[PDB]
Design a protein around this ligand. Structure first.
Ligand code: FES
Ligand SMILES: [K+]
Ligand SMILES: [K+]
Ligand SMILES: [K+]
Ligand SMILES: [K+]
Ligand SMILES: [K+]
Ligand SMILES: [K+]
Ligand SMILES: [K+]
Ligand SMILES: [K+]
Ligand SMILES: [K+]
Ligand SMILES: [K+]
Ligand SMILES: [K+]
Ligand SMILES: [K+]
Ligand SMILES: [K+]
Ligand SMILES: [K+]
Ligand SMILES: [K+]
Ligand SMILES: [K+]
Ligand SMILES: [Mg+2]
Ligand SMILES: [Mg+2]
Ligand SMILES: [Mg+2]
Ligand SMILES: [Mg+2]
Ligand SMILES: [Mg+2]
Ligand SMILES: [Mg+2]
Ligand SMILES: [Mg+2]
Ligand SMILES: [Mg+2]
Ligand SMILES: [Mg+2]
Ligand SMILES: [Mg+2]
Ligand SMILES: [Mg+2]
Ligand SMILES: [Mg+2]
Ligand SMILES: [Mg+2]
Ligand SMILES: [Mg+2]
Ligand SMILES: [Mg+2]
Ligand SMILES: [Mg+2]
Ligand SMILES: [Mg+2]
Ligand SMILES: [Mg+2]
Ligand SMILES: [Mg+2]
Ligand SMILES: [Mg+2]
Ligand SMILES: [Mg+2]
Ligand SMILES: [Mg+2]
Ligand SMILES: [Mg+2]
Ligand SMILES: [Mg+2]
Ligand SMILES: [Mg+2]
Ligand SMILES: [Mg+2]
Ligand SMILES: [Mg+2]
Ligand SMILES: [Mg+2]
Ligand SMILES: [Mg+2]
Ligand SMILES: [Mg+2]
Ligand SMILES: [Mg+2]
Ligand SMILES: [Mg+2]
Ligand SMILES: [Mg+2]
Ligand SMILES: [Mg+2]
Ligand SMILES: [Mg+2]
Ligand SMILES: [Mg+2]
Ligand SMILES: [Mg+2]
Ligand SMILES: [Mg+2]
Ligand SMILES: [Mg+2]
Ligand SMILES: [Mg+2]
Ligand SMILES: [Mg+2]
Ligand SMILES: [Mg+2]
Ligand SMILES: [Mg+2]
Ligand SMILES: [Mg+2]
Ligand SMILES: [Mg+2]
Ligand SMILES: [Mg+2]
Ligand SMILES: [Mg+2]
Lengths: 108, 168, 71, 86
RNA sequence: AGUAAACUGAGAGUAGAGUGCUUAGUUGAACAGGGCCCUGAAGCGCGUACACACCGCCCGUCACCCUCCUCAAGUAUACUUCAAAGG
RNA sequence: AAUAGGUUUGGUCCUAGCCUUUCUAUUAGCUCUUAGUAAGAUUACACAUGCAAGCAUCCCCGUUCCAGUGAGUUCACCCUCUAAAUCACCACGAUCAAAAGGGACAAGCAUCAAGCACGCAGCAAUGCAGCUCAAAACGCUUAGCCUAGCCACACCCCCACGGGAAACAGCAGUGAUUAACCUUUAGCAAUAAACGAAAGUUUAACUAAGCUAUACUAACCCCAGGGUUGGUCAAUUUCGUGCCAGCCACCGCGGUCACACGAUUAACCCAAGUCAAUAGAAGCCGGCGUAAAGAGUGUUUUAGAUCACCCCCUCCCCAAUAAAGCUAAAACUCACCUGAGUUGUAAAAAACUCCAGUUGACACAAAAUAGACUACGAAAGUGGCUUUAACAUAUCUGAACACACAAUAGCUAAGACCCAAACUGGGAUUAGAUACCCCACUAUGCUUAGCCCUAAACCUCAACAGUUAAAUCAACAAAACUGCUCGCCAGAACACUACGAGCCACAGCUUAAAACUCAAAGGACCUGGCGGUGCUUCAUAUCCCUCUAGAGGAGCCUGUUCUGUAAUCGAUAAACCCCGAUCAACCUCACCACCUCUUGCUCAGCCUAUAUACCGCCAUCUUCAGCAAACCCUGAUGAAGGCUACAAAGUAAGCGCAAGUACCCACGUAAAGACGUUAGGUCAAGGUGUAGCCC
């Protein structure tokens, strides 16, 4: 562009940064509604343990439960953080192991 | 690279190299020049090279240009008293034009030196405060004085935690 | 150059024209409803003008025309 | 990158080549040595008598990154970082 | 081309066992020119979205699922505005 | 974004997004010794209790400050003028600083484009009709700010007479709420403020303490944790698991040797912390033939540019445009004569048979040859003839929207109609054929009058001015650049879409997003494969025809598949099928049933699995002639490529072919036949890796 055009348009404007599933917050509190397993997209194969929670913001979302084995049940409290599960399309939240009702993974 | 011919003009270093600082009386400076003609060449280079430097040193003086309104180029200054100063610039180079207006309406090197000195009186070296305004923030920075407790813990005798303990 | 970008646009346009043809009676009822609300929103704007200026009724002899009808 | 680097480094003009091409002294000015003029190259042939023309304003093309850095307008968290001796 | 065709013998392996296999010999032909749809090849080209390489890649309808969005009848709720005025 | 790095492909180059490495803050997990210092609700939600403003011979003064908060939000800055206040009292003053006047002053959205009284003159009466706005008015949304500090607010109704109602956004503290969590301490000794003439008095300001790894500094005989260890990126042993369980920021890992999962061992990094999540820091002088981008055409405005004076060489004519008139060839129709068929083609059917051929008369349709020309017009467009009118501008640039145009298709109305022809009907093809092929006919193509406003409207290359030298240049395409201006672009897809707005448009056009999603998409090349791919030349028992004897039909022999049986295995398109077998009544034998043995013919054994771990021996192209180390050169030193004999960048050991040898020759037949192809065949010739069985 010419100098006249650059002067007329002004400095560039960054697109307003989009908030993720945590709405720009480190963690969110949630209530477990149901548990289930999801199949990852190809070429991965597994039954990844997930759950649907009602976030403290009123929104419902699916969350991945990391680690080997969990004991989450309906009406239990969990803390969810960011970070997508790479091979689970649409799953963008992760339960924090060792907080509220979700305990740490049992050794071996 | 930077756009346009002579991109040096669009640098802060070049703009600060102007030596024309108008007296407080100058309020308006009109420039009448012609786009073509060998005798108006110095006036065109003056508009091309020097007008930015003049405006930079005199931000509150109105500068307005006019093209091909008369047969010859000229400058005209309007002073606060109502006086008008006509300067014929036909045949002169842009450097001779800058030296001319500096002589008749520019502040001399003496008047400018004094103004710079009166500014230095605003930042007294002995004052303490934020780095934006002062050299040192606290007297504890002066060698020989009691240093800041954040770096050198004070003796227990100079601390209220133990003055009140002994007294109480 | 191949025409793969054209082909994507080709199918998009084909499916859109077919969708419009399949629902042209519903869309005609929706369009009619929008033009009515559009006429009402225009009448409110003019009424806001003479009410905020102190008048109690429209200027003498004024009738807001229907500027969105096919006629 | 490699081929371009060797092209640029092989096509550079030394100070002696500059002195011979223009028939003038190449004088170096160092801020650590003050105003002392240091002659780094002199023409082997005859020495010109007419000074090099002093254009009031050079029509050289500038790099915006160099100008933006000299004006303190260059802001980058990755520039001027501390690194191991290279 | 001593080829095909026909005829005859021997051998390997078994205790014995093939209309199979290996091998020697006898009699002993016909046609051999033209062509490139098909199978395939060579040279020189062209095209290519295939590279797991055409048994490729690939497009849309419908069904079945989770995510988001839009339209929308009727109705309800909330919010905004008024005096920045007149007698 | 940097000194950069990883990731698009079979491969290369280009472009490009995403991510990595750095530095902070908050929160979470696990962990945590001391001292000093700094800092310290998520919430303008609701608040129990205590305290936070007095002073003083009464009047007054103060409680309008300080302290708090960030809801709202261009009242903060400069100038002019001028109050209150200080200088005991006047200060024609200074200082400080309101109100008023002038100027300046956040972000995003133009899909907020018009606002609707927003001006001026006059002493007045009243007159004029103006004022703001794409250089962004008006409007919506977001946000305390330009931090020695400033602004704003003080439960709400902008305000606070009044009303709702009964107030911690003062300190400490509590409830609710949030990922977010300090004591219901002391003292007016210092400083500051209020009051007093003053000694002084008061103060949750403040000062000195309490609590907390949030940070900084320092230290400690004993006392270290957290996270990582496939690559980016510093660092893994042994087991378990077996596309399961699980893992990653990106690319990816896991299907029986997992440095990527879990445990364990060791190592690496930082360290009283560690680093999971989140947020921030870090970004316009680059581009627009083919990657996103020159938006169909021209003109001008406000303006911008220096390409305007100087200083100059393509005026007129050829297929611009509008109007009116005209017609040569070919059709249609009609008429006479003649024929009995005409049409359709790879081949048929349907169709017509007032049909066909010759001859004559005969267009509101379309314009051979010229044209191997390259002209005209702004573009769209324009190539039969004649005439009239006629092709802007003595600087350039200048619009999705203003102004005027804009192929084809299409709409409205009235006409013409040879031919063509969506649709439709009939015929045929096909598994089907709503197509491709044949026939018929309509809208439509034409004229007139109005609309509609689109195109691969692309020569995908903006206008004007200039250059051919330098670095000529990623690739391809149509060589590379400079000055100047306008337009436009910023990962892919969503999307020529939704919504808004405008429009003679009502299934339309123009303008044109977002959410959800992915880590690529894309451009140009290289090699290979493939092509119902072109040309040229071929196959010599050979692809087709030609020659001879056969197979395919019958019976029998024999293999295989199926079926059957308690009852092997292997081969199994060419390249399996009288094949491993130059050979099964027992044996062979590896199978089935029953019975028996346990250091066993063997310093055991296994015809158990895996030929997709292999050696060994082979099939196959091969009824081939190629393979290739080591070099050299070309392509800007990219993937890659390397020949022309009147020769132009290739030289090549070795291997194969060849040559030799066997058989009756030098002929023929054998034998030979590389590198590679089919993870081709064989673990059941034998051997053997891995795994498995051992009364
Ligand atoms: S800064 Fe001076 S005593 Fe702390
Ligand atoms: K996998
Ligand atoms: K499908
Ligand atoms: K990259
Ligand atoms: K008092
Ligand atoms: K305050
Ligand atoms: K605020
Ligand atoms: K208020
Ligand atoms: K005190
Ligand atoms: K922590
Ligand atoms: K013609
Ligand atoms: K277009
Ligand atoms: K084109
Ligand atoms: K090819
Ligand atoms: K083998
Ligand atoms: K074997
Ligand atoms: K084996
Ligand atoms: Mg990944
Ligand atoms: Mg092509
Ligand atoms: Mg699509
Ligand atoms: Mg790959
Ligand atoms: Mg807030
Ligand atoms: Mg006063
Ligand atoms: Mg004021
Ligand atoms: Mg605009
Ligand atoms: Mg919209
Ligand atoms: Mg505004
Ligand atoms: Mg706010
Ligand atoms: Mg309150
Ligand atoms: Mg209030
Ligand atoms: Mg409090
Ligand atoms: Mg905190
Ligand atoms: Mg107290
Ligand atoms: Mg404290
Ligand atoms: Mg293992
Ligand atoms: Mg591990
Ligand atoms: Mg493009
Ligand atoms: Mg022709
Ligand atoms: Mg123009
Ligand atoms: Mg525009
Ligand atoms: Mg357009
Ligand atoms: Mg048109
Ligand atoms: Mg028409
Ligand atoms: Mg017809
Ligand atoms: Mg018709
Ligand atoms: Mg006509
Ligand atoms: Mg065209
Ligand atoms: Mg233009
Ligand atoms: Mg995009
Ligand atoms: Mg379109
Ligand atoms: Mg549309
Ligand atoms: Mg719409
Ligand atoms: Mg038979
Ligand atoms: Mg068998
Ligand atoms: Mg088998
Ligand atoms: Mg097998
Ligand atoms: Mg037996
Ligand atoms: Mg037997
Ligand atoms: Mg056995
Ligand atoms: Mg094999
Ligand atoms: Mg021989
Ligand atoms: Mg042989
Ligand atoms: Mg040989
Ligand atoms: Mg195999």
């Amino acid at each position: 562009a010419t100098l006249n055009q650059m002067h007329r348009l002004g400095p560039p404007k960054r697109p307003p940064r989009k908030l993720g599933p945590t709405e720009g917050r480190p963690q969110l509190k949630g209530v477990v509604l149901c548990t289930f397993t999801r199949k990852p997209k190809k070429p991965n194969s597994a039954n990844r343990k997930c759950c649907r929670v009602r976030l403290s913001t009123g929104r419902e979302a699916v969350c991945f439960i990391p680690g080997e084995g969990h004991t989450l049940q309906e009406h239990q409290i969990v803390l969810v953080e960011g970070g997508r599960t790479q091979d689970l399309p649409g799953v963008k939240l992760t339960v924090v192991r060792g907080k509220y009702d979700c305990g740490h993974v049992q050794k071996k | 690279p930077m756009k346009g011919r002579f991109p040096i003009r669009r640098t802060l270093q070049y703009l600060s190299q102007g030596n024309v600082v108008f007296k407080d009386s100058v309020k308006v400076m009109t420039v009448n020049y012609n786009t073509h003609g060998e005798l108006g060449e110095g006036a065109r280079k003056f508009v091309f090279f020097n007008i930015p430097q003049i405006q930079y040193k005199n931000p509150w003086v109105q500068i307005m240009m006019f093209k091909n309104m008369t047969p010859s180029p000229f400058l005209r200054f309007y002073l606060d008293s109502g006086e008008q100063v006509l300067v014929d610039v036909e045949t002169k180079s842009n450097k001779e034009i800058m030296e001319h207006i500096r002589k008749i309406l520019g502040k001399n090197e003496e008047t400018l030196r004094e103004e710079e000195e009166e500014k230095k009186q605003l930042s007294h070296p002995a004052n303490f405060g934020p780095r934006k305004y002062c050299l040192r923030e606290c007297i504890c920075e002066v060698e020989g004085q009691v240093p800041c407790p954040s770096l050198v813990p004070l003796p227990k005798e100079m601390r209220g935690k133990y003055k009140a303990a002994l007294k109480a | 150059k191949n025409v793969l970008k054209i082909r994507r646009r080709k199918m998009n346009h084909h499916k859109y024209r077919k969708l419009v043809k399949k629902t042209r009676f519903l869309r005609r009822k929706v369009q009619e409803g929008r033009l009515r609300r559009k006429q009402i929103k225009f009448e409110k704007d003019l009424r806001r003008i003479w009410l905020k200026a102190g008048l109690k009724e429209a200027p003498e002899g004024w009738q807001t025309p229907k500027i969105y009808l096919r006629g | 990158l490699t081929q371009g680097l060797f092209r640029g480094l092989s096509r550079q003009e030394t100070h002696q080549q500059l002195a011979d091409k223009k028939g003038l002294h190449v004088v170096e000015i160092r801020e650590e040595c003050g105003p002392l003029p240091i002659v780094v190259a002199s023409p082997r042939g005859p020495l010109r008598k007419d000074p090099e023309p002093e254009d009031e304003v050079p029509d050289v093309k500038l790099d915006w990154e160099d100008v933006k850095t000299a004006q303190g307008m260059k802001r980058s968290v990755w520039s001027n970082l501390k690194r191991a001796a290279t």
